Amino acid sequence: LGPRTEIANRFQSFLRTFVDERGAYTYRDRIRRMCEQNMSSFVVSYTDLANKEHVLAYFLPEAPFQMLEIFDKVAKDMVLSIFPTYERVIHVRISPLIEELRTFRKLHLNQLVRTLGVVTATTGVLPQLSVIKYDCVKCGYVLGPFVQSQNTEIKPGSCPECQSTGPFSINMEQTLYRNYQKITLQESPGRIPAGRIPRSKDVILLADLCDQCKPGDELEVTGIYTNNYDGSLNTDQGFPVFATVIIANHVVVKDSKQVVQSLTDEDIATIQKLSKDPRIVERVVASMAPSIYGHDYIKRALALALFGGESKNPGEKHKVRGDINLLICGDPGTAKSQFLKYTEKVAPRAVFTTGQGASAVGLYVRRNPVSREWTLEAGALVLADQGVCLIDEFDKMNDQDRTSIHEAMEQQSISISKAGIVTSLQARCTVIAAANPIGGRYDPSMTFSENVNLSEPILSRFDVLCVVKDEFDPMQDQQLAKFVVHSHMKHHEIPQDLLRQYIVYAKENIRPKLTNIDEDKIAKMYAQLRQESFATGSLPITVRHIESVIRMSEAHARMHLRENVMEADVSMAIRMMLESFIEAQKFSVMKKMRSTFQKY
Amino acid sequence: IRNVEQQFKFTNPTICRNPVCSNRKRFMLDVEKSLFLDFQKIRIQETQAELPRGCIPRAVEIILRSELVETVQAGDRYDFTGTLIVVPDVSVLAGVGTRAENSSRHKPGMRELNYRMAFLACSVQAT
Amino acid sequence: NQQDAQINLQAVKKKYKEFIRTFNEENFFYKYRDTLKRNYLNGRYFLEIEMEDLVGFDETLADKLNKQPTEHLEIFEEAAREVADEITAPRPEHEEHMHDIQILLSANPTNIRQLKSDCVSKLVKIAGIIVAASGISAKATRMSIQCLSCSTVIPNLYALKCNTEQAGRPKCPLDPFFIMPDKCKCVDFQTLKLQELPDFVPQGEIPRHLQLFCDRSLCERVVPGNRVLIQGIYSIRKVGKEKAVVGVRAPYMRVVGITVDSEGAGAISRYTSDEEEHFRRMAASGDIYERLSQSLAPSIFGSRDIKKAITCMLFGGSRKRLPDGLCRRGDINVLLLGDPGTAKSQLLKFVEKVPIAVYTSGKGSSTASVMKDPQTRNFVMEGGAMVLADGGVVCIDEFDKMREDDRVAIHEAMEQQTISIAKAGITTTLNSRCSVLAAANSIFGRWDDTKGEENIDFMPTILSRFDMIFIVKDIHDESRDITLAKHIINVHLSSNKSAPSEPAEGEISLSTFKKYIHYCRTHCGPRLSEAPITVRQLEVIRISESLAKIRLQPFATDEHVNEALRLFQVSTLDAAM
DNA sequence: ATTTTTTTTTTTT
Ligand SMILES: Nc1ncnc2c1ncn2[C@@H]1O[C@H](COP(=O)(O)OP(=O)(O)OP(=O)(O)O)[C@@H](O)[C@H]1O
Ligand SMILES: Nc1ncnc2c1ncn2[C@@H]1O[C@H](COP(=O)(O)OP(=O)(O)O)[C@@H](O)[C@H]1O
């Protein structure tokens, strides 16, 4: 072509001469950074491209493919002219103006494009080709066409192996590959235009852009719109069988569950100088859920379920446990509606599911090839590495769904038996549920396992609780109609975007371990209660009555970064247990009051 | 070729333009500097101001062009254009009416033909 | 002959054969040479080599053979059948016929997440963990056909002119080539498979893998559950450019020069008289029966006089068959029962290492596997686990908390070993010398146990076929409740207790003990002496005969060995009344 | 004809 005369010159005029930000533009050093990183993914921003030459926007999308090749060749001609040294061992990137799902259209094919999506379940990784070698049947001399050739034929009887070989042979060797894995698309439930058709489309990536995706997770892409190579061409039915394919140039994160702040750095000190002491059971707690009045119990409650998961392997036994577990029995009429929102934004891992009617039966392993229509789906347990399953109306789920969950709490894992493949799934996760009772809406101080009927081997694995019987208290209700109006009159501590720094650091640094500090007290909570709290509602003491306490009293102190412990914050957490445990037993209940008000 | 190859009765492989070339071979070409469309598809059941004895609101099938696309939702009333046209089938099941072909006579797998109906449109008024 | 480069003969011309005769130094043992001569001790028909003698010889061939290796190796086949066949006879008096062999190569490993076109047709060292693979079917190289009667000379391990023609004019084109396989040759295959590493992000990703090709001698060598180092070849199988939107293709490799890992102390599984002195001159001590009551719990207290009853358990009784039919229940079992918190999980978990067993319970083997595979849709089975227990025994919890389907095969094994199938129209009537330890968290503990019989709501049968049922409790004993309250902080903390029981007189040494047993349970046909106590208390007699093999004696008496009786009085008080 | 699924009936203490 002619105009490419100018382009290469114009590229080389900026990749090592055009500079912003007070010299030494990165591109002069980016090349060598990636070179010493063995990485090969030079990146650009269209902003700086536009700062150089805004003519770089409209001779481009007559064919955006030529822009990238013309850039790749400047790369090669810059790499080895300067670094012929490492020439015995490219593609580029761009990453800035958004377009939307279902706005790419008939007209947005094969041009400058910038586009978004979300991940789900898809296939594995595989290789592709670039190069034409086939010949050797008559003479089969070395001929060597001069390109790696994508979809190219000549097929003569004359070709330089004594210009022969009209018949044909094939090679299985000296053959370039390039790995590749397929996607599945999804679209966000935040940016909903009210229940329109659910997004899933053919979209593509490549060798280097590979082995990074994860289900129900998101990544912003540059992307450019094309179609399948041949969508069902024959004189045929009353429609063509057409789909359309997108392909990835640069993949740019939408989630960032890790560190999120790139080049906030000004407010970061307020976390560890205000969420570090034992007063933070009031500072970090005043902002615990300041939405509506009732039940400050749950504010203290839910604050510490969010917090942990750990190895700390005891002596040579096994892995013991690293999970959280909550459940409540309420009544719609309770203010229990918002059951999963905010600290799952705090959560680096989690995935939602409302109740039966829409509860997961996936919660089934084969292995296939891919012809048309080959897929399988099941449980999210790899996902939720210290994440949570966010649910209401749990009591209806399937016993065998509970099997995995009991095993997750028991051996930190699930155990398939008698299948084709016997692959596994490790359980480092957390759970939330919101069921309803039997026989009504709540049964009193009478027993709790039958206040709402779960089964024997299942609930023993569960940890947290909060329960609401609720009689009247008037001043707060008048306050609440005042709250009705003034909250419907929005006529129109720890910083809010940094509290997550606490899940980063608090659980991270201080992970105390201890001898028996006074824990023969728990020998009493064993034995005395085996003789004191005897027959009212009074079985429930186990190793998990304290192992759960390791789970969460430690969280309560880990809030503080103590690193060494006496009984103080431990039993302040057991002040939840003086409050949580009391709830399950007959109105001859104050055996706990007597037996713990010193532990209060 | 800026011709009209958009049919269901279509063939990518064609014979020649100027010279004599093959009759099965083909190129593939400028799907990039060209003119296209967009559409959708539905089903629709019989109306309720019209309701006869015996019979039921059967389902009937349409594609419609683009500027009408996704401007709808369940539960409306209309005065569409009902311009019914047929299927240009690819294969048929229980279409055992005449089985034949436009085949020349003799002197010194084949195809069949049995279709079914549809509908089509051009204009809407939700009422 | 193309004598410029890529020369087609050099190897067999003189070079590699003679380098091999240069593999020839003093001590008169420096040889890769009489290796086969010690293969001809049996006719193994193969040989081992390195890739770091050619480096010790030159720096010219190592970058050369990598291009055409699978050519070099049949060049080496040729080298051998030319060389050793010289050595089949000094002077003209020996050769029946030649034959064929294989060569084994082997240094430093690689991984799988880095290998593509860049390193194609290149020989590599990597490692994973095997999964499963096929049997061995068939292959050959050559034969011939009626049509031309020429050997079916093939390079690689298309389809042709008729040549049943020259009978005057007549031709017969369009390929009438009818293979005559009785003229043929023959090779092996397995077609293997493995999975990549467990440390290189198999969690957030999915594990990729490789497909393989075995040749002659290397099958019947490797079963999955193993960890290996291998060399191969980076090749594929298809040809090219709605599958493959442009050109996609599939991965595999070959077999060359496997070298496995045999990691240390696992493998008395697949692959002295001083130790017999250790066996017996320790056995002379009459201090083993109750001595080891602090042994099987090398970290726990309790079960002491019940560890007294394990001493008879594994040693077994006697299958003293008769001139008439029976093969009665020499095997013996146990039952235990109680609530969680007593560490009865870890009691079975730690017991796994202490002869052959498995420890899973409920909804997660079972019965047979009468299903299919991929390979020309066969139907072939996996058996039961009386299969996997025929001298091996098991320790298994949660009878009650398991599917009610696989419970006809409990009475069909514990009572008689009366096993049978009818899935397809037949009774595979396999049998086995199995027994079991049982555990449970069954209904209501010692408040239930001492009093009458209501534990399982389907059968009273479970008290009949077994004898030693000693209760698991979390008894309150305040003097020990605090101890067990602080018997759980040393366990909870500090990761110290690997071999704390090693110093004990003779209540440790897993290997020697397992071997103690697995000699002992193969001594003779021991017996006893002349010497509600009903018929299944008595049918304990197995324990009577046991103390012959516990003292490692032939004989024993009733009431010295009613030690078992006095231990059973632990159980009988549960269900006397 | 089989693979990946889902309900609507078939018949209930
Ligand atoms: N203590 C309280 N504080 C604030 N609001 C309350 C309180 N008690 C009751 N309410 C009101 O009672 C209503 C109860 O019905 P609600 O919408 O909570 O059902 P629900 O709890 O969401 O049912 P489910 O949780 O099973 O989905 C709430 O809208 C809430 O405004
Ligand atoms: N004497 C003890 N020594 C050590 N750990 C103990 C002891 N008693 C109880 N435990 C505790 O019991 C727990 C195991 O209970 P487990 O055996 O799982 O009950 P179950 O067998 O019903 O499942 C262990 O985590 C361990 O810490």
| Distance separating alpha carbons of residues C252 and C441, to the nearest angstrom | 50
| DSSP helix/strand/coil, B79 | coil
What residue type is assigned to position A337 of the chain?
S
First to last CA, chain A: 84
Task: Report the 3 state secondary structure along A284-301.
Answer: HHHCCCCCCCCCHHHHHH
| Distance separating alpha carbons of residues A41 and A210, to the nearest angstrom | 13
- In the block, residue with structure tokens 């490789």: C210
Nearest CA to ligand 2 atom 27: C488
Closest alpha carbon to C340 in C256, C401, C279, C273: C401
Report the relative pairing of strands C179-180 and C144-145 from DSSP bridges: antiparallel
Which secondary structure element, helix H or strand E, spans residue C468, and what is its range? strand C468-471
The token duo for B36 is 């296209």
Q: Cβ contacts of residue A247 below 8 Å, gap of 6+?
A: A203, A204, A205, A206, A223, A224, A226
Burial class (CB in 10 A: 0-12, 13-18, 19+), B25: exposed
The token duo for A45 is 């921003």
Strand partners, C180: C144
Would an 8 Å CB–CB cutoff place A238 in contact with chain B?
yes
Closest alpha carbon to C45 in C80, C83, C11: C80
Report the relative pairing of strands A118-119 and C48-49 from DSSP bridges: unpaired
Calculate the alpha carbon distances from C110 to A155, C115, C127, C197 in Å.
41, 9, 8, 11
* Mutate which: C233, C242, C366, C401, vs A, most A CBs within 10 A: C242
Rounded to 5 degrees, what are φ and ψ at A302? Answer: -70, -20
Closest alpha carbon to B80 in B107, B60, B55: B60
Strand partners, A426: A413
* Packing angle of the helix pair A296-305, A567-580 (nearest 10 deg): 120
Q: Cβ contacts of residue C212 below 8 Å, gap of 6+?
A: C133, C190, C191, C192, C193, C194, C232, C252, C253, C254, C255
- In the block, residue with structure tokens 């400047």: A74
Strand partners, A180: A126
Experimentally, the structure was elucidated by: cryo-EM
| Distance separating alpha carbons of residues C357 and C372, to the nearest angstrom | 27
Which secondary structure element, helix H or strand E, spans residue A474, and what is its range? helix A474-487
The token duo for A506 is 């608090």
Burial class (CB in 10 A: 0-12, 13-18, 19+), A404: buried
* Packing angle of the helix pair C510-520, C273-283 (nearest 10 deg): 80
- In the block, residue with structure tokens 């013996």: C332
Angle at the Cα of A364 from the Cα atoms of A360 and A367, rounded to 5 degrees: 140
| Distance separating alpha carbons of residues B56 and B46, to the nearest angstrom | 8
Which secondary structure element, helix H or strand E, spans residue A476, and what is its range? helix A474-487
Rounded to 5 degrees, what are φ and ψ at C311? Answer: -60, -30
Query: Cβ(A218)–Cβ(A203) under 8 Å?
Result: no
| Distance separating alpha carbons of residues A593 and A184, to the nearest angstrom | 56
The token duo for A28 is 């002069």
Query: Cβ(A429)–Cβ(A422) under 8 Å?
Result: no
Per DSSP, A315 falls in state S
Q: Which of A230, A403, A542 sits opposite C340 (nearest CB)?
A: A542
Q: Report A:180-199 residues touching B (Cβ under 8 A).
A: 196-197
| DSSP helix/strand/coil, C571 | helix
Rounded to 5 degrees, what are φ and ψ at C252? Answer: -165, 180
Closest alpha carbon to A47 in A95, A11, A8: A95
The token duo for C331 is 């095997």
Would an 8 Å CB–CB cutoff place A81 in contact with chain B?
no
Neighbours of chain C (3+ CB pairs under 8 A): A
The token duo for A385 is 């590495």
| Distance separating alpha carbons of residues A134 and B102, to the nearest angstrom | 41
Angle at the Cα of A258 from the Cα atoms of A255 and A262, rounded to 5 degrees: 85
- Please compute, for residue A186, the number of CA atoms within 13 A of its CA located in the half-sphere on the CB side: 16
Strand partners, C452: none
A370 touches strand D (CB under 7 A): no
Task: Report the 3 state secondary structure along C495-534.
Answer: CCCCCCCCCCCCCCCHHHHHHHHHHHCCCCCCCCCCCCCC
| Distance separating alpha carbons of residues C560 and C562, to the nearest angstrom | 6
Residues 328-367 of A with CB under 7 A from strand D: 364, 366
Report the relative pairing of strands C129-130 and C193-195 from DSSP bridges: antiparallel
Residue A398 CA distance to nucleotide D11 C1' (Å): 24
Mark C449-467 as b/e (b = at least 16 C-beta within 10 Å). Answer: beeeeebeeeeeebbeebb
Closest alpha carbon to A30 in A102, A79, A88: A79
Strand partners, C335: C469
Helices (H) and strands (E) in chain C, counts: 17, 14
| Distance separating alpha carbons of residues C262 and A63, to the nearest angstrom | 58
Query: Cβ(C420)–Cβ(C427) under 8 Å?
Result: yes
| DSSP helix/strand/coil, A522 | helix
Report the relative pairing of strands A388-390 and A351-352 from DSSP bridges: parallel
Closest alpha carbon to C196 in A368, A124, A214, A209: A124
Per DSSP, B104 falls in state P
Q: Cβ contacts of residue C65 below 8 Å, gap of 6+?
A: C54, C72
3-state helix, strand, coil in chain C (%, to 5): 25, 10, 65
Torsion of CA A47, A53, A57, A60, to 10 degrees: -120
Closest alpha carbon to A323 in A306, A301, A338: A306
| Distance separating alpha carbons of residues C117 and A175, to the nearest angstrom | 6
Q: Residue A158's CB: how many other CB atoms inside 10 A?
A: 11
Task: Report the 3 state secondary structure along A83-97.
Answer: CCCCCCCCCEEECCC
Chain breaks of chain B after residues with C–N above 2.5 Å: 108
| Distance separating alpha carbons of residues A556 and C89, to the nearest angstrom | 86
Closest alpha carbon to C311 in C299, C294, C328: C294
Subunit contact B87:A233, Cβ cutoff 8 A: no
| Distance separating alpha carbons of residues C457 and A534, to the nearest angstrom | 27
Q: Residue A197's CB: how many other CB atoms inside 10 A?
A: 9
Report the relative pairing of strands A118-119 and A185-186 from DSSP bridges: antiparallel
Report the relative pairing of strands C436-439 and B59-64 from DSSP bridges: unpaired
| Distance separating alpha carbons of residues A121 and A123, to the nearest angstrom | 7
| Distance separating alpha carbons of residues B92 and B89, to the nearest angstrom | 7
Cα C303 versus chain centre, distance: 33
Q: Residue C186's CB: how many other CB atoms inside 10 A?
A: 12
Query: Cβ(C290)–Cβ(C307) under 8 Å?
Result: no
| Distance separating alpha carbons of residues A475 and A23, to the nearest angstrom | 67
- In the block, residue with structure tokens 């880095």: C114
* Packing angle of the helix pair C541-550, C563-572 (nearest 10 deg): 140
* Mutate which: A199, A233, A241, A245, vs B, most B CBs within 10 A: A233
Q: Cβ contacts of residue C575 below 8 Å, gap of 6+?
A: C449, C452, C453, C463, C469
Rounded to the nearest whole angstrom, what is the distance from the C-alpha of residue C500 to the centroid of ligand 2?
A: 19
The token duo for A179 is 């790995």
| Distance separating alpha carbons of residues C292 and A465, to the nearest angstrom | 46
Q: Residue C549's CB: how many other CB atoms inside 10 A?
A: 22
What residue type is assigned to position C385 of the chain?
A
Report the relative pairing of strands C468-471 and C334-337 from DSSP bridges: parallel
The token duo for A314 is 């005891």
Q: Is C371 in the pocket of ligand 2 (CB under 6 A)?
A: no
| Distance separating alpha carbons of residues A460 and A544, to the nearest angstrom | 8
The token duo for C558 is 């009733």
Task: Report the 3 state secondary structure along C189-202.
Answer: CCCCEEECCCCCCC
Q: Cβ contacts of residue B16 below 8 Å, gap of 6+?
A: none
Q: Is the dihedral of CA A577, A578, A583, A586 positive or negative?
A: positive
Residue A406 CA distance to nucleotide D5 C1' (Å): 27
Strand partners, C229: C127, C259
Which secondary structure element, helix H or strand E, spans residue A35, and what is its range? helix A26-37
Angle at the Cα of A174 from the Cα atoms of A170 and A175, rounded to 5 degrees: 80
Which secondary structure element, helix H or strand E, spans residue A553, and what is its range? helix A544-558
| Distance separating alpha carbons of residues A139 and B6, to the nearest angstrom | 46
| DSSP helix/strand/coil, A127 | strand
| Distance separating alpha carbons of residues A136 and A164, to the nearest angstrom | 10
Q: Is the dihedral of CA A470, A472, A477, A479 positive or negative?
A: negative
| DSSP helix/strand/coil, A552 | helix
Q: Residue A453's CB: how many other CB atoms inside 10 A?
A: 12
Query: Cβ(B12)–Cβ(A233) under 8 Å?
Result: yes
| Distance separating alpha carbons of residues C306 and C320, to the nearest angstrom | 26
Nearest CA to ligand 2 atom 17: C343
Query: Cβ(C106)–Cβ(C91) under 8 Å?
Result: no
| DSSP helix/strand/coil, A458 | helix
Q: Hey, which bits of chain B come out as E strands?
A: 40-45, 59-64
Rounded to 5 degrees, what are φ and ψ at A351? Answer: -160, 140
